[PDB]
Each structure stands twice: as C-alpha cells, then as structure tokens.
Amino acid sequence: MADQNERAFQKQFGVNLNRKVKPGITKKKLLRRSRDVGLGFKTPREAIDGTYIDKKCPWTGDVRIRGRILTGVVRKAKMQRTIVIRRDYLHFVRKYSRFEKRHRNMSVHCSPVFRDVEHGDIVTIGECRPLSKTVRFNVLKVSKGQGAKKSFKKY
C-alpha cells in the first residue's frame, strides 16, 4: 500500500525486528507469520510477503472470522480499505403469492491483500467484531479473481 505514511509507526503487533538475542540459532529471515483462517480460503501469497500491516485484516491482524459467511456484489469501493456491497434477494408476500425484490448494503472492510477490487465483482464476506461503527464484515474471497471478460481483449 503506502509505506509508513502515518504519524505513528504502523507496525505488526507481536512481531520483532531483532537478531541479537535468540535461543538456538534459527533465523530464516521471513519474520511475519500469517494466520490462515482455514475455512476453505487459501491465503494469498501477498499475505506472506506483505508490506501492509492492516490491524483489521483477518490474516495479518487481530480479527478472526466467526458467524455468518455471506456473499455480495461490489457497488462502490471508495473508502480507505473499505468497500460497500450489494446483496440482492427476494421477499415473498403471501396474499399475492408473488415475490418482492429487496436489497441491503453492507459496509465491508476490504483487506489490502485483495489488489484491484472493483464493482461489480462478486465477493464472499464473513462476520467479525465491530471494526468501525457500521463495519462488521471482512472480505474473505473476491470471487472474480481473473478477468473473465474485462482482462479479455482479442489480439
């Protein structure tokens, strides 16, 4: 993302940039571990060589997925590491036996491990602790991945 452009030192908690004192001799010089949330979600390679920290990321921060896993299509992606999704469904009414179409918007935290998140890509989200005032969900898998029609161009 941006490399320490805040007033504080944006640092990963509990990791150490230290070499002098260590029991044994065990270096291997890749010092940040990643969580794997392991719910079917292969963690990306950029959560291993990740220069971002993101204290609200579920792989490299102190949030962990629990509760509902939902899906949604992106509509706007303009906030700082935060998107909003569209979640389209139907509400059946029984004095007509027809469907009534509704939707909701969810303020969703977008981890910086997902480069190039656009609307309208499909996104699988998952519930967390209250992250900021309306956010309660992290992205877990943006379901476009490749460009199946937008990275396509003939010749």
Partner: protein, 261 residues
C-alpha cells in the same frame, strides 16, 4: 446483570418436560444454579412430591432434605431445589431406593430404579480438554466436574464412567462409527443408538446420523449426542425398553388398545 439475575421463574414458563400442571400454583421450582442448566434439570421438589409422592405439600420436602436423608451423587445436597440433571444418581440408601435420572423417549425423563452395585458409578461425557489446572492437564465434564490428570487419548466428544466415591476415570468410551449413543435435547430425545456417520461442518454445528435397532435412521446435532458404549454395549442399565421409536398409533395400540383389565 441489568438489575438481574432473575431469581423467580413462572409456571407455564418452566418446561413441560418435567410435566408440571398448568393449575397448581403461579410459580415453578427454579433450580439453584448447580452443575446442570435450568432447562436440563429436575429440582428436588419434583422428584419427591410430584413423582415418588413421599410428600404432598412443598413444606414436606424441606422436612426431608434438611435431615440429610437425601443424597445426590454420594454427597448429601440439602439444597431444597438442587438441579440434579442427567444421570445424577440419587442414591437413597434409606430407604434403599437407588434411582438414576435417565430421559424417556417422549422428550421427558423417566424414573428408573437401578441396581445398587452399578449405582455407585455413573457415566458422563467430556466437553473441553485444557491446560492450567493442577498440574498441567484437566478436562471438564457435561455436568462440569473438572477432574485432573486424565488419559492423553481422551479427546472431546467422548464419555468416561466416574465412580461416585472417587472422582477418577476408570473407562473411556470414545466417538467412533460403531458406538451406540443416546440423544438429549432436541425433538429426537430419549432415542438410544446407534451411530452411522457424522457430518463435520467446519464452523460450526456438526450433525450426526443415528440408526435405531428398528432400522430407523435419523439425525440430530452433535451437541445433543451422549455416548453410552460400543455396538450392542449397554454400559449402564437403561430404563423401559430402549426408546424403540414407537409409532404414534402403536402406543395407542400396544397398551391403550391391547389392554387387559
């Protein structure tokens, strides 16, 4: 906590798995926070006046339990409303009674007078194996009897028989696809054995498939599943005949219609 914690509980709000009548009082026994939860309890005003009919008022129960004649799980338990849930061996050596609270197939419990030799141990399942209690290991039981220093092959989802004089393990029955089981908590209550297959849903709420001796395959959550031995292994005495998954009309045909009188 919000001006709590609600010391009362009403009749027609206590469960009808204890078969309380709608008239007979405004209130309900309200068990005093023991090992078992409230909706999985039988307070000792129920077991003495309503069931055994040793009393006839509510005052004639504190004139029983305060004389230390009652004995829940070897200890005395002079609490007049002790919860005393699943498989709590109420071992009355006077006047030689030796019950055990095992649950009936109709969703309810049933009075089951057991043998006095196997009364002095009971079977209980484990919930969380963890470190920290002395010295490193301990596990918690379904009633919550934390017992230290267990076998390192007892994981969760298994049961161990606890002697009532000690607090020590003697045998473990672990969760394989050959072990007969028992259900407590859902619509499938009281039905006994045997396991087929468990569907592990990662995060969360695994369900498991259970096949009765009639071939009656069904399913319930893994939370409700106790375990009481291997295939055709009753490791405790069970009550009336196993919870066969009777039909609805067959109980109206077994003894209600086919009735000698």
């Amino acid at each position: 906590m919000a001006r709590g914690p609600k010391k009362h509980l009403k009749r027609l709000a206590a469960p009808k798995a204890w078969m309380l009548d709608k008239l007979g009082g405004v209130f309900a026994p309200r068990p005093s926070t023991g090992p078992h939860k409230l909706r999985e309890s039988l307070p000792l005003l129920i077991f003495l006046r309503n069931r055994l009919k040793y009393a006839l008022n509510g005052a004639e129960v504190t004139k029983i339990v305060m004389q230390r004649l009652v004995k829940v799980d070897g200890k005395v338990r002079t609490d007049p409303t002790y919860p005393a849930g699943y498989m709590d061996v109420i071992t009355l050596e006077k006047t030689g009674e030796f019950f055990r609270l095992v649950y009936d197939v109709k969703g309810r419990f049933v009075i089951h007078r057991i043998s006095a030799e196997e009364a002095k141990y009971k079977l209980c399942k484990v919930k969380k194996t963890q470190l920290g209690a002395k010295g490193v290991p301990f596990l918690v039981t379904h009633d919550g009897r934390t017992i230290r220093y267990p076998d390192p092959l007892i994981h969760a989802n298994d049961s161990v028989q606890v002697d009532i004089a000690s607090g020590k393990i003697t045998d473990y029955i672990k969760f394989d696809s050959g072990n007969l089981c028992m259900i407590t908590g859902g619509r499938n209550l009281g039905r006994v054995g045997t396991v087929v297959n468990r569907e592990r849903h990662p995060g969360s709420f695994d369900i498991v498939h259970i096949k009765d001796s009639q071939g009656h395959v069904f399913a319930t959550r893994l939370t409700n599943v106790f375990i009481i031995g291997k295939g055709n292994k009753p490791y405790i005495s069970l009550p009336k005949g196993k919870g066969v998954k009777l039909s609805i009309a067959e109980e109206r045909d077994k003894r209600l219609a086919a009735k000698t009188h």
